[PDB]
Structures are given as structure tokens and as C-alpha cells.
Amino acid sequence: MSILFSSILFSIATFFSRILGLFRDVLFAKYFGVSYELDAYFIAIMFPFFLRKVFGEGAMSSAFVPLYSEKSGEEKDKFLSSVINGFSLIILALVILSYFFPELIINLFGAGSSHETKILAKKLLLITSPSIYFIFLWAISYSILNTNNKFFWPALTPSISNITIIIGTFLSTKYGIISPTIGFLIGSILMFFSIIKSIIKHKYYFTIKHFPHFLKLFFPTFMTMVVSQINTVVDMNVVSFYDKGSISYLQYASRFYLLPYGLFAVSVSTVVLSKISNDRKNFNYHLNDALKTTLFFTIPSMVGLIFLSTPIIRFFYEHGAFTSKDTLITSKILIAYTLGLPFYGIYSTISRSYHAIKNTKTPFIAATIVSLSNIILDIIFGLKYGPIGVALATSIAGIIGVLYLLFSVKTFPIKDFLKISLNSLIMLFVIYLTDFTDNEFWFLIQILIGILVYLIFSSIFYRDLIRRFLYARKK
Numbered sequence: 001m002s003i004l005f006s007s008i009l010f011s012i013a014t015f016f017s018r019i020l021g022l023f024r025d026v027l028f029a030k031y032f033g034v035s036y037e038l039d040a041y042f043i044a045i046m047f048p049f050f051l052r053k054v055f056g057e058g059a060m061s062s063a064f065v066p067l068y069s070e071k072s073g074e075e076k077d078k079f080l081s082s083v084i085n086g087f088s089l090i091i092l093a094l095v096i097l098s099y100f101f102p103e104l105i106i107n108l109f110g111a112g113s114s115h116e117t118k119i120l121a122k123k124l125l126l127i128t129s130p131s132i133y134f135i136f137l138w139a140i141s142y143s144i145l146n147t148n149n150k151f152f153w154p155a156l157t158p159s160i161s162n163i164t165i166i167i168g169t170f171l172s173t174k175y176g177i178i179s180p181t182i183g184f185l186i187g188s189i190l191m192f193f194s195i196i197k198s199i200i201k202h203k204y205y206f207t208i209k210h211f212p213h214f215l216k217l218f219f220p221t222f223m224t225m226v227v228s229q230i231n232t233v234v235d236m237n238v239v240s241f242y243d244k245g246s247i248s249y250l251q252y253a254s255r256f257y258l259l260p261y262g263l264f265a266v267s268v269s270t271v272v273l274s275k276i277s278n279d280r281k282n283f284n285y286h287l288n289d290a291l292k293t294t295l296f297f298t299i300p301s302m303v304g305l306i307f308l309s310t311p312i313i314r315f316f317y318e319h320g321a322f323t324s325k326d327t328l329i330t331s332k333i334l335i336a337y338t339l340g341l342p343f344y345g346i347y348s349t350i351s352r353s354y355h356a357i358k359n360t361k362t363p364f365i366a367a368t369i370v371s372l373s374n375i376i377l378d379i380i381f382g383l384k385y386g387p388i389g390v391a392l393a394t395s396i397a398g399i400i401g402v403l404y405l406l407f408s409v410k411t412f413p414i415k416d417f418l419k420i421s422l423n424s425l426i427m428l429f430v431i432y433l434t435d436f437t438d439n440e441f442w443f444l445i446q447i448l449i450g451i452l453v454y455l456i457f458s459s460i461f462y463r464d465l466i467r468r469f470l471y472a473r474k475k
């Protein structure tokens with residue numbers, strides 16, 4: 001498939017998974033409310049949750065796919081075995097350590113939590129810790145499927161874990177908090193089993209010979225692909241340091257922002273890796289293609305999400321004691337983050353294009369520029385300008401990183417940028433004309449209308465592209 005179609009499929013599958021994640025969270029609130037036991041569950045799943053998130057955004061494939069795709073036969077099998085064996089040894093050590101030093105682990109991941117929460121989290125850790133083994137294997141299978149140009153089904157697999165956790169939550173009336181905890185572990189196992197064929201179609205070897213060279217690429221690419229996780233941790237701690245009272249606003253804005261980020265900032269960047277890795281001589285053609293598609297996703301989503309940020313925050317959060325005044329500040333933080341969406345999309349797409357040809361140094365430089373710029377801007381301006389300033393600093397840091405990366409690749413599809421921007425402005429105009437009611441659900445219709453208007457006028461202004469695609473099909 002084309003980068004556009006594979007990226008749409010990635011985003012659709014991700015959306016479906018995230019819908020079930022929303023239902024999972026709704027049921028948590030229903031079956032546990034605010035209880036220290038749910039807090040213990042969240043501590044216990046923090047690290048595996050983190051691993052699944054970052055691997056789902058390419059932190060494993062960036063190093064695995066370019067080395068795996070360039071090998072064949074016995075070599076390919078021995079590479080895959082080296083990676084599995086190497087990480088299995090590490091993961092075994094980590095799980096054993098967590099079983100012997102649970103207080104240390106929980107003190108690390110559960111700092112600031114109450115005593116009773118930590119005591120329970122130490123028990124639940126015994127159930128959640130082994131999940132990292134199945135998350136790692138899932139990520140390897142995921143990478144292999146991507147190498148074969150398969151993106152929809154891999155991106156749908158988190159649905160499996162969400163369903164198992166939902167089931168465990170339903171069963172918590174009889175069994176309590178251990179039930180969703182076991183659901184989390186079972187979910188990780190079933191996610192891997194659903195795509196186990198990708199691994200076990202290879203022959204297994206008792207080797208680790210390729211593991212050191214793999215790690216040489218894994219370290220910088222992992223750090224490059226987790227930069228936004230770092231920015232989030234930095235932002236949270238700066239806001240917590242400067243203004244305790246604002247941390248919930250930042251958390252709520254960030255929590256929602258994860259949706260458009262996962263749908264639109266890392267879709268093309270996931271697809272472009274295997275596209276270029278399997279056709280490395282056409283790096284520049286595929287990169288420009290991917291940059292166009294990245295903009296095609298991120299510019300209209302930025303524009304529409306900013307216009308609808310207040311109705312979005314209101315719908316999800318304006319209940320109970322969360323007033324319209326809380327909605328206002330939170331929506332402003334969300335806007336500040338959303339301004340960065342196309343820049344983090346471009347950063348991810350260029351970084352992954354470099355990874356495809358095994359250039360880890362240039363994106364690692366960019367990652368260091370982004371993360372350090374964010375830290376510095378957070379500290380300098382966090383006190384005066386509050387959580388809005390902190391969120392805006394994250395977006396500005398992304399701009400700085402993108403400027404470095406664009407100067408490195410020496411290319412940008414300016415004409416398509418202008419066409420996409422115009423179509424996004426036409427979309428915004430129509431959304432504005434439909435903005436005539438305070439009804440709390442209307443923004444959902446407005447999102448649908450926005451998508452349809454954008455696609456309709458995209459088809460008008462990309463008519464030659466469509467004409468060719470249509471005739472190529474008919475031929």
C-alpha cells in the first residue's frame with residue numbers, strides 16, 4: 001500500500017483500541033471510584049504500561065526493522081534469536097529483582113503515594129511484573145508485521161488487553177482489585193499470542209551474537225522515540241514544583257492530548273520506517289511522501305482540536321466539582337500542547353526515516369535538542385506563565401528540534417503544505433458555521449463534519465493525484 005492508506009489504517013485501528021480504553025476507564029470509575037486500591041493498580045502497571053506505549057510508537061521497531069529487513073535466511077533467524085534471547089535474559093533479571101525488592105520498585109514508581117497504597121501495590125506487582133516479558137515479545141512480532149507492510153491488525157491488538165481488563169473489572173465485585181490486575185497480565189499474554197506466528201515462523205537458535213550490535217542502535221533510537229514521554233515527566237514535575245494547584249489541569253489536558261498524538265503524530269512515522277528500510281535508495285522520495293502525509297493528518301487535527309478544545313474538555317471533565325472555570329484553564333493548556341502536534345509529527349517522521357537507513361545519530365541529536373530545550377524553557381518560564389507556558393514550551397521545543405531536522409534533510413513539501421493549510425482553513429470555516437449550540441454532544445457532530453469537509457476539499461485540490469490513482473486501479 002501507499003503511505004497514506006497504511007497510515008489511515010494505523011490510525012483507524014488505534015482509534016478503535018482507544019475507544020475501548022475509554023470504556024475501560026469509565027468502568028474503573030464505576031467499580032472503584034476514588035479508592036486507594038485503584039491507585040495501587042495504577043502504580044503496579046506503570047512500567048508495563050509505559051513499555052507498551054513507547055513500543056507501540058516505534059521504540060522497538062526503529063532498531064529491529066532495519067537490521068532484520070536487510071538480512072535473509074539463516075542470518076535473519078539468528079538475528080531475531082539474538083534479540084529475543086538478549087532481552088529475555090534482561091527481563092528475567094528485572095522480574096526476579098521486582099520479586100525480591102518490591103519495596104524498592106514501588107518506592108520508585110509510587111513516590112508520594114500513601115502507605116496503604118504502597119503495601120497493596122507491592123502485592124499486585126507480582127502479577128503485573130511478568131507482563132513485561134509478553135509486552136517485549138508482542139513488540140517484536142509487531143515489528144515483524146510492520147516489515148511486511150501490515151499495520152492495521154498490529155495497532156488493533158491493544159483492544160485485546162482492554163477487553164480482558166474490562167472483564168476483570170466487571171468481575172471485581174466478586175474478586176476485588178486483583179481481578180483487573182490479573183486481567184492486565186492475561187491481556188498482555190493474549191496480545192502476544194494473537195500475533196505469535198510472526199516470531200515462531202522462524203527457526204530458533206541459542207545465540208546472542210547479534211545482540212550487542214542491536215543494542216548499539218536500540219539505545220539511541222529508544223531515547224529518540226520516547227522524547228515526548230520525557231517531556232511529559234519534565235512538564236509534570238516543573239508544574240508540581242512551581243504551582244501544586246495547577247497539576248490536575250495539566251494532567252487532564254495531557255491525558256486528552258494523548259489521543260490526537262497517538263492517532264496523528266506517530267502514524268506516518270510508524271509506516272515510513274519499513275517503506276524506506278525496504279527501498280533505501282529512495283530515501284528522499286519516501287521521506288517527502290511521508291512529510292506530505294504527516295502534514296495531511298496533523299494540520300487539520302491541530303486546527304479543529306484547537307477550535308473545539310473547550311467543548312472537548314467540557315464533555316470529558318466538566319462534571320461534579322470541575323467547573324467551567326476549570327474547563328477554561330485546562331482548554332488553554334490543551335491548545336498550547338496542540339500547537340505542537342504537526343511539529344512532533346514531523347520530528348517522528350524524519351527520525352524514523354533516518355532510522356530506516358540506520359542513521360541513529362542525527363535523530364538522537366534532535367531528541368537531545370528537544371528534551372533539553374523543553375527542560376530549560378520549562379524552568380525559565382514555568383513560574384511566570386504557569387502550566388500554559390509549560391505546555392507551550394513543549395511545543396516550542398518541538399519546533400526547535402524540527403528546524404534542526406529539516407536543515408539536516410534539506411527538504412520540505414512547501415506546495416503541499418499550502419494546499420493542506422487551505423483545506424484546513426476551509427474546514428475551519430464550515431466548523432465555525434456549525435458552531436451555533438451549547439449542546440454538550442454537538443462537537444462530536446462537528447468533528448465528523450470537519451473530517452468530511454476536509455476530505456471533500458482535499459479530493460478537489462488533489463484531483464490529479466486521485467485521477468491517477470483511479471486509473472491505475474482500473475488498468
Ligand SMILES: CCCCCCCC/C=C\CCCCCCCC(=O)OC[C@H](O)CO
Binds near residue numbers: 089091130
Ligand atoms: C515469565 C516472566 C519471566 C520471563 C523471563 C524470561 C524467560 C526466559 C528465561 C531465560 C532466557 C534464557 C535464554 C537462553 C538463551 C541463551 C543463548 C546463549 O547464551 O547463547 C550463547 C552462545 O553460545 C553465544 O552466542
Ligand code: NA
Binds near residue numbers: 378392393
Ligand atoms: Na514544556
